[PDB]
Every structure is written in C-alpha cells, then in structure tokens.
Amino acid sequence: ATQLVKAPIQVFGIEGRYATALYSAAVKQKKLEAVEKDLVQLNASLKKFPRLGELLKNPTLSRQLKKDAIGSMLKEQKAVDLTSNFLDLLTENNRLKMVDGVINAFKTIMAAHRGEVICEVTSAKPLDEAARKDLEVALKGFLKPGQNIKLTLKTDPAIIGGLVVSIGDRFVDMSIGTKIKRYTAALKTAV
C-alpha cells in the first residue's frame, strides 16, 4: 500500500493514521523537510493567535470558510502542495479540530527518522560548567550509531539531591531523595 520506512515510530489513533499517510506522501516525494517546517510554522501561527484556532474549531462555521481561511494563512507561509492537500483532507472530513494532534504526531516522526531520542534529566538544583557537557558525553554512549540526543533539563528541590534520568525506553531513579526515602521506609518496616 503505502511506501515508507515502515513506521519508524509506533503512533496510533486516527490522527496517527493521518500523520503516517502524510509521512508516506512526503517521503515518496522529496518534500519531507519542507512539509515539516511549514507544519511547524502553521503550529506556531496557531499558537500565536488563539482566535484563529477558535475560528477553525467552531462547529457553527461552515467548512468552506475554514478551508478558505486555511488557504489564506498558508499562502503567506509559502507552503507546498502536500501540506495544502493534507489540510484540505483534514477539513473535508471535519477533523481539523484535531489539527494540533496530527502536527504533534508529525513532530513524533522526524525524531526516530533523525535519530533524536528524547531524554529528560531532573536535578535538585540547576547546574552548569562541570555539569551539562559530561552528561552529554555520558548520554552519547547510550545510543547505537546514527542516533542523537534531545535533552530537556528540569529542576525540583523536592528530590533533595541526586538525579532523575528518563529515556524513551527505560527509567532510572538514582537520586538521593528516593534512596533515603526507601531506606527509611525499610528501617521503619523492619526495625
């Protein structure tokens, strides 16, 4: 049926079906990066003006007005034919109310396609200098060749100390706060 990289991720739902069809259409042609960047620009324009999102997600308004507004705001972004056909298909089936989902589903692709794995590191306090770069060096060896790391850093003083590291497949809770919490729980439940 559809010729692609045969689901680089496992994305589900009807919005996942639309995103995989758009990925197959944009990988049969050489327009994958163009449709990715105009969908990013479209999502940025929708988040910039919530009145446009309220106009699109209004059941009172007719679908012809919605597709006219979609084409009007895609002309100024200098879009391609593939994303115009994708948005016309979304507004034809009255599924443009979930236009935030498919783009997010399309953001879920081009992470495995580009090898980017999402990593989340949470610390008691934000650190730099001696930190950061050694964390990147440690995380670089956690991947097979051809993959990259997209790192998000968080701070939370409630974990007392240590580090909370989560990858897209596994989790490790090697933190001081959880360690002393389970040690005190063991001491209370035993002694």
Binding site: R170, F171, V172, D173, M174, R182, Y183, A186, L187, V191
Partner: peptide
Amino acid sequence: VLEEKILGAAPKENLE
C-alpha cells in the same frame, strides 16, 4: 539488625 537491613536493601537500578 540495622546494618543487615541496610546492606540487604540494595537498589540495583540498572536497565529496568
């Protein structure tokens, strides 16, 4: 007893 409970409470946070 406290030392035995501490030594036996190995987290072993690997793979998982």
